[PDB]
Design a protein around this ligand. Structure first.
Ligand SMILES: CCCCCCCC/C=C/CCCCCCCC(=O)O[C@H](COC(=O)CCCCCCCCCCCCCCC)COP(=O)([O-])OCC[N+](C)(C)C
Ligand SMILES: CCCCCCCC/C=C/CCCCCCCC(=O)O[C@H](COC(=O)CCCCCCCCCCCCCCC)COP(=O)([O-])OCC[N+](C)(C)C
Ligand SMILES: CCCCCCCC/C=C/CCCCCCCC(=O)O[C@H](COC(=O)CCCCCCCCCCCCCCC)COP(=O)([O-])OCC[N+](C)(C)C
Ligand SMILES: CCCCCCCC/C=C/CCCCCCCC(=O)O[C@H](COC(=O)CCCCCCCCCCCCCCC)COP(=O)([O-])OCC[N+](C)(C)C
Ligand SMILES: CC(C)CCC[C@@H](C)[C@H]1CC[C@H]2[C@@H]3CC=C4C[C@@H](O)CC[C@]4(C)[C@H]3CC[C@]12C
Ligand SMILES: CC(C)CCC[C@@H](C)[C@H]1CC[C@H]2[C@@H]3CC=C4C[C@@H](O)CC[C@]4(C)[C@H]3CC[C@]12C
Ligand SMILES: CC(C)CCC[C@@H](C)[C@H]1CC[C@H]2[C@@H]3CC=C4C[C@@H](O)CC[C@]4(C)[C@H]3CC[C@]12C
Ligand SMILES: CC(C)CCC[C@@H](C)[C@H]1CC[C@H]2[C@@H]3CC=C4C[C@@H](O)CC[C@]4(C)[C@H]3CC[C@]12C
Ligand SMILES: [Cl-]
Ligand SMILES: [Cl-]
Lengths: 597, 597
């Protein structure tokens, strides 16, 4: 049935796969992306505090399970920088660095699996409850700001490995500040051989990237830069024996064999639930952003809810099979597309390359220095840092879009990354109220010899109709802007009906221009409860000083809510609702005439 | 100057005060409200965990300082139920109940003063920075929900005092649940004499309230119920000697003398900053709500910012002079108005009544049982509990207004009161995005023999113009709803321009109805950055399949932001902006004719 084929997209898109003009392309793309996943896999695993094999496990399992339940065709899932950074924060916070090393690593990976599990379950939940419309509310400025901030943290973290210092640091409030001054203090304790292999690594990386970009193809597959750099570095550090002689830190023992099946111990559920919620939201945001971009560019559509179910299932299975939360990335996805990726066959191919390295190659990466991994992370951070090109653009167009970007960026750098995201999302939602809370109110006049009405301050041509005052608000009337609307009505019509009633009563017990106000509700998108209360007030007041109030332009939903809210018994009838300002005006003049006689 | 008179309203409204038809009324109102403040002062002081004299200090100082800097004329400030409940939470959390008693009380009141100070400073800050428009965003359902929840907590807290049990409880997550089952467990440990004086207290209160309400005036001032009940109870508990014989808990020693000048020790600033922020926001919300209600009803206006400055100064001075955060209340304000309050002279009068009780009367309230105070609190909780009459009303009109009320109510009862308020405010802001995220899109037709255009599905009369497709969205085009807008455009116009371009290119390299789309932007309130990007996409796509796109109805601000965002160089010129759908249609038909030849 259509439900089972929509809950397993693989069973629908796989039979249709034409093996002649696609298979070659997807195999090229898969080999290119596998060659890129291995080094980064290990690197991002260090950045999350886990042992190095978890990167390989996270590069193997997730892409498979996604290929099965996933709707996007150009996304590459795996271990990505910012999710790695969040997992790292949690692990070293629940497990300080102080037999002992293996005990610490066992508790570390238990925390990692609990994180993966809870994040998977949250993503899966949101997907089943059809709440995948809430990923719309994660603004593009919000995620730009967020990922740029996180790239500042990731850059600072990998400075220490890059010199060879042994600085402890935090990800807590203002931690960046004392972390960089910690690095400025301990720069005389710089290992020189570590700095050497770091700069050698960067030189080899920039040579290979520039060379294979500008120079002639002579290759169906581009040159895997990170892989050959990792290979050359481990060979050098094994021959010249850097580890024991010069004291250069290396990657530990990488074990041979498939992942062991594990169980995330939920004893830690109340400690890590906060960071698991942050991991789930960041995963959704970046995975679905990428999917949507490539889908638009290649002329197809992804389902947000099925993407949440896919990503959720991916992380839960990974949780059992010794992984840490995977997510879509723009860098791998760009590489998977530019290589000639057409389907999730490319993901399956990449995962087979990581698989053969998990089984066979394995402990050849013993003598790999940690400085080469830190350099790889930095050259891949280019992407996220070039998003500072967005703060001027936003500035030029919309200052509230600029502020969302700035608040999230500063939130992330100069407080926690979880707190940064929370503050950013709040401010993001507030900016809608801030746009609608002082709307654009106008008094309309008729253009001479035409049956259209427009603003009198903006179109001096338009004349007010005698006896008839027409006022138009250009916004919803809800709790934020209802007091303002009533005030601006009483200011631009130049009548306060309660002051006028007070004057008239006072004069009569001691012994206005218009007879009809027409509210143009064409632009009133919606009303809430406070809006309806305010409208009842306005109509009752102007009834008391003897002024009929007509509504000209209400949409169906506003009339229905005014009807529910009891607008239609305090003097106003549904015979006072007109279709256009003109019809209201005509009826008003006609009533005035037939009531004169 | 006008600044000094606006920063001290007393210096402007006091000289004008006419001593003949007001002074008598304000003195009656002041005596009525002083008589009501004394008992409740003490009661609410117990509910906040402080010693009983702090209620009297908080009933004396704040009303004075408010009379000086305050803009409202019917508000009565003092110690109110919900602020008392928040202060209490903080105190017993930072100071558990375990010489010893006086040491604990000293640290308790130090915490209380720090709370008052920080809350005052936050209110003052918001007022100076002209951020008093943010008190608009605190919806009426949000505050109804919140105060009703808090009244459930306050009611449960005063059950234990009312029976005479010695149950410990919390205000933490789900604390209500195990707190009520704690009371159900310990009901066999009920003191009988305590329950006696509790029920005697309630009987005297309901007798005096009903009697002085229905029966003949024979009185310029109504009968102060709470005061005479406190007096009768202390006399009974002193003669019959309840305290030592039957073990009835009593109010401690109430000291004679003016408050001592104190200093809030800011060693506790990082412990109590959260709860001080909650106290400041709840104070603003309830004070300004009351001020606005009575101002509307009596035909004047209050300044939100000057109210924040007034309330801030009030709490800072109180902080120094041995008080805890005061706020406006609807109950006292109603009583101050119904008694014949005209100005803040009534507040000054009330504070003089509390003053003479601080100096002279004082330790006569030694033998006052705590059960009488708990009964007074419960009969004053009527107000807040009768707000359950709001959940049906909201339900009937607007389900999102109903959900704001429910989420805040449940947040407050079944989690923390601070967390309840935070969750409520979030959801409150989200409901604006939820209303605007799937707006009402339409395809418009011309009414026959009329130059107006309306929906074709809703008005079958209207016919589409040949060659011209008119589409109208009835919302802002921002990040929440921009993908939807593009989708609904491509669905209701029945053309996907990228699919059409693909078909045409494919056909040409192997070997639509309309020529003009008119976007009616009359109801587009605003655009953000993502909106402009989407609009550029739409225009570029329909340029590629050879369809001119005109904008008919953009307001000034949208055109300016489209101009900034670079909308006006990808094929569209400012010569494609029309004033009305009709003008666009005419121009489109004319261009088509003159281009045919
Ligand atoms: C009661 C509960 C309260 C509890 C507390 C909670 C309080 C919550 C907080 C709420 C406070 C937020 C209020 C914002 C009001 C909106 C006004 C607004 O922004 O419109 C813009 C002004 O803004 C700008 O353009 C400013 C940009 C510069 C700011 C920092 C630069 C630093 C550079 C780098 C230095 C780095 C570090 C420095 C930073 C420190 C002008 O807008 P516009 O041009 O007219 O166009 C758009 C139209 N609108 C939007 C205005 C309609
Ligand atoms: C664990 C529980 C967490 C619950 C959180 C609840 C959810 C959060 C809700 C968030 C709602 C909105 C809060 C964000 C306010 C933005 C401020 C702003 O406009 O400043 C802008 C940049 O300034 C910045 O750089 C801001 C940096 C971050 C913002 C801090 C806000 C306070 C919360 C931090 C909490 C600290 C906690 C301490 C440690 C725990 C510039 O100001 P501006 O005035 O717009 O400038 C233009 C001038 N005019 C003309 C417009 C006026
Ligand atoms: C990606 C990031 C995510 C991270 C996670 C964060 C997730 C954040 C969460 C977000 C989730 C919120 C989504 C809400 C969707 C809006 C739909 C909506 O409410 O419209 C209404 C349906 O709603 C109702 O009427 C329901 C009312 C009853 C509910 C409980 C009753 C209990 C009674 C007592 C029992 C007590 C206990 C029981 C309670 C347990 C229908 O609306 P309508 O009639 O058409 O009129 C208005 C029109 N609109 C508004 C619809 C346009
Ligand atoms: C200290 C740091 C704090 C930072 C917080 C950050 C800021 C918070 C941001 C708040 C943003 C929005 C969150 C509120 C979600 C409302 C849920 C909803 O719609 O349910 C409603 C009632 O259900 C209820 O009774 C809800 C009760 C409270 C809501 C809990 C939300 C999770 C946060 C709690 C945190 C727990 C923390 C644990 C302890 C610390 C009904 O659901 P519905 O689906 O609408 O029903 C109608 C059905 N359809 C048709 C509409 C579908
Ligand atoms: C996409 C890739 C190929 C870009 C080129 C990568 C190499 C050759 C170059 C360009 C990108 C560069 C990194 C980008 C980011 C930064 C941050 C900056 O504050 C210090 C230099 C540093 C750390 C750069 C070092 C050199 C670098 C790694
Ligand atoms: C310092 C951290 C917070 C990064 C934030 C950078 C912000 C504050 C800076 C970076 C570059 C800046 C822009 C650079 C260039 C111009 C062009 C000029 O004609 C108007 C100002 C404008 C548009 C600047 C506005 C502020 C800006 C966006
Ligand atoms: C405004 C005043 C005068 C109302 C009348 C007060 C007295 C006479 C009456 C009516 C209001 C009543 C209280 C209102 C609230 C509740 C909550 C309910 O679950 C149990 C009874 C209890 C605790 C009531 C006890 C009796 C009570 C105190
Ligand atoms: C139990 C706690 C959470 C209090 C919340 C009460 C809510 C869920 C209840 C209280 C009273 C109820 C209302 C009582 C009466 C009616 C009239 C009927 O024709 C339609 C339903 C309607 C409108 C009910 C809807 C739900 C309602 C508002
Ligand atoms: Cl990446
Ligand atoms: Cl009260």
């Amino acid at each position: 049935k259509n439900l089972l084929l929509s809950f397993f997209p693989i069973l629908e898109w796989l039979p249709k796969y034409n093996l002649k003009e696609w298979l070659l392309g997807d195999l090229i793309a898969g080999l290119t992306v596998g060659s890129l996943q291995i080094p980064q896999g290990i690197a991002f695993a260090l950045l999350a505090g886990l042992p190095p094999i978890y990167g390989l496990y996270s590069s193997f399992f997730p892409p498979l399970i996604y290929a099965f339940f996933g709707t996007s065709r150009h996304i590459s899932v795996g271990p990505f920088a910012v999710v790695s950074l969040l997992v790292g924060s949690v692990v070293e916070r629940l497990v300080p660095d102080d037999n002992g090393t293996e005990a610490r690593d066992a508790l570390r990976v238990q925390v990692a699996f609990t994180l993966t599990f809870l994040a998977g379950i949250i993503q899966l939940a949101l997907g089943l409850l059809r709440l995948g419309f809430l990923v719309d509310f994660l603004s593009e400025p919000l995620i730009s700001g967020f990922t740029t901030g996180a790239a500042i943290h990731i850059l600072l973290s990998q400075l220490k490995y890059l010199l060879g210092l042994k600085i402890p640091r935090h990800s807590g409030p203002f931690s960046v500040i004392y972390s960089v001054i910690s690095v400025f203090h301990n720069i005389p304790n710089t290992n020189i051989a570590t700095l050497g292999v770091s700069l050698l690594s960067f030189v080899l990386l920039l040579v290979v990237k520039e060379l294979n970009k500008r120079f002639k193809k002579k290759l169906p597959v581009p040159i895997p830069a990170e892989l050959i750099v990792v290979i050359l570095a481990t060979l050098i550090s094994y021959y010249f024996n850097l580890a024991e002689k010069y004291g250069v830190s290396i990657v530990g023992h990488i074990p041979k064999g498939l992942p062991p099946p594990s169980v995330p111990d939920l004893s830690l559920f109340p400690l890590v639930i906060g960071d698991a919620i942050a991991i789930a939201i960041v995963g959704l945001a970046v995975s679905i952003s990428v999917g949507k971009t490539f889908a638009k560019k290649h002329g197809y559509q992804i389902d947000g809810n099925q993407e949440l179910i896919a990503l959720g299932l991916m992380n839960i299975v990974g949780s059992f099979f010794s992984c840490y939360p995977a997510t879509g990335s723009f860098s791998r996805s760009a590489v998977n597309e530019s290589a000639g990726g057409k389907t999730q066959v490319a993901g399956i191919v990449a995962a087979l390359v990581v698989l053969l390295v998990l089984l066979f190659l394995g402990p050849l990466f013993y003598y790999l220095p940690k400085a080469v991994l830190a350099a790889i992370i930095i050259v891949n951070l280019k992407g996220l840092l070039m998003q500072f090109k967005d703060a001027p653009k936003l500035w030029k167009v919309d200052k509230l879009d600029f502020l969302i970007w700035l608040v999230t960026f500063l939130g992330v750098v100069f407080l926690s990354v979880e707190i940064g995201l929370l503050v950013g999302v709040g401010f993001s939602l507030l900016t809608v109220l801030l746009r609608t809370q002082r709307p654009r109110t106008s008094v309309l006049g008729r253009i001479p010899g035409t049956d259209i009405y427009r603003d009198v301050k903006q179109y001096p041509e338009a004349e007010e109709v005698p006896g008839v005052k027409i006022f138009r608000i250009d916004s919803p009337i809800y709790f934020a802007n209802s007091e303002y609307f009533k005030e601006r009505l009483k200011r631009k019509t130049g009548v306060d009906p309660v002051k006028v009633l007070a004057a008239r009563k006072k004069a009569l017990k001691k012994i206005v221009d218009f007879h009809t106000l027409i509210l143009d509700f064409s632009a009133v998108s919606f009303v809430d409860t406070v809006g309806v209360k305010t409208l009842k007030e306005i109509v009752k007041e102007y009834r008391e000083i003897g002024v009929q109030v007509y509504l000209a332009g209400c949409n169906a939903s506003v009339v229905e809510k005014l009807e529910r809210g009891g607008f239609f018994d305090d003097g106003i009838t549904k015979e006072h609702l007109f279709l256009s300002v003109h019809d209201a005006v005509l009826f008003a003049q006609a009533r005035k005439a037939l009531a004169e006689q």
